[PDB]
């Protein structure tokens, strides 16, 4: 539940709270933690190069390269998010944090992947980006997850990071926003998650020094309470507005 | 610099920890499925 707000290097109080957490959650917690922290020497993990867009790349190629970079950073299972993402910050600050993620080259969670996917596609004006958020229910708890929706040349897809392969990147082959969102819902079914809310944001501006924040909740649907045809009608109406009008931020 | 070598040891320890918790999360998942 913890978030590193102390920068790099991580300070002692944040560092100890990470280890106490994993010591509590892991079955051989004490033995395993001591094994790492006391290790005389540890191999320096290789540092993946930040992907650069090249003329030999298609748009799907570029998105795949971005997604592979994210997979190489790895999903963060430690219980301590390493970069503080204040969702309501201006884009310019969020982009600074994204540069910082490419410098420190640490594991990331879903929200950070979204910020990093915006940063890494700011240079391709024909890729539109918009957050898609889910609140799901599973055995007595609510879960929040977010991915980066992508619209390009008439198709939808997504970038992101998750514990689950089926809850992050999606190829740019969905003809409608609904098909994309419904593919996430069917992927959540595999893990016995009921989707309670779906939240679609606006297109994120490509200006890396934007004073505007991300709009995360332009459209909010309580899908657990809706029949599928009405979900589809609502998403199609909304996605058509995204592609044509310029909408006032819900906020 | 003292700072730079501390960030590298912390990065090495984070990736070792991330492997352990990824492995734990995986066998907890398989444990769940077979029940």
């Amino acid at each position: 539940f913890h978030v590193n707000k102390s920068g790099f290097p991580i300070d002692s109080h944040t560092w100890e709270r990470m280890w106490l957490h994993v010591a509590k959650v892991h079955p051989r917690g004490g033995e395993m933690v001591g094994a790492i922290r006391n290790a005389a020497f540890l191999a320096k993990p290789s540092i993946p190069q930040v992907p650069n867009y090249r003329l030999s790349m298609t748009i799907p190629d570029w998105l795949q390269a971005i997604q592979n970079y994210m997979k190489t950073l790895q999903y963060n299972h430690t219980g301590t998010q390493f970069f503080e993402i204040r969702k309501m910050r201006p884009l310019s600050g969020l982009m600074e944090t994204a540069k910082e993620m490419t410098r420190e080259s640490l594991p990331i969670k879903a929200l950070e992947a979204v910020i990093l996917g915006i940063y890494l596609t700011n240079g391709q004006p024909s890729i539109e980006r918009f957050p898609i958020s889910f609140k799901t229910y599973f055995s007595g708890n609510y879960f929040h997850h977010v991915v980066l929706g992508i619209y390009c040349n008439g198709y939808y897809g997504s970038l992101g990071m998750s514990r689950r392969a089926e809850l992050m990147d999606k190829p740019l082959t969905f003809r409608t926003l609904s098909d994309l969102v419904f593919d996430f819902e069917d992927s959540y079914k595999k893990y016995l998650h009921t989707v309670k809310k779906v939240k679609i944001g606006l297109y994120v501006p490509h200006e890396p020094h934007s004073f505007q924040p991300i709009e995360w909740k332009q459209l909010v649907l309580n899908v657990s309470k809706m029949l599928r045809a009405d979900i589809r009608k609502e998403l199609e109406k909304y996605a058509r507005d995204m592609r044509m009008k310029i909408l006032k931020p819900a906020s | 610099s003292a700072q730079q070598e501390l960030k590298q040891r912390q990065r090495a320890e984070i990736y070792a920890l991330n492997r352990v918790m990824t492995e734990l999360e995986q066998q907890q998942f398989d444990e769940f499925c077979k029940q």
Binding site: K109, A110, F138, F143, L167, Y191 | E25, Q28, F29
Partner: peptide
Amino acid sequence: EGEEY
């Protein structure tokens, strides 16, 4: 167990 994410 809890299924995260």
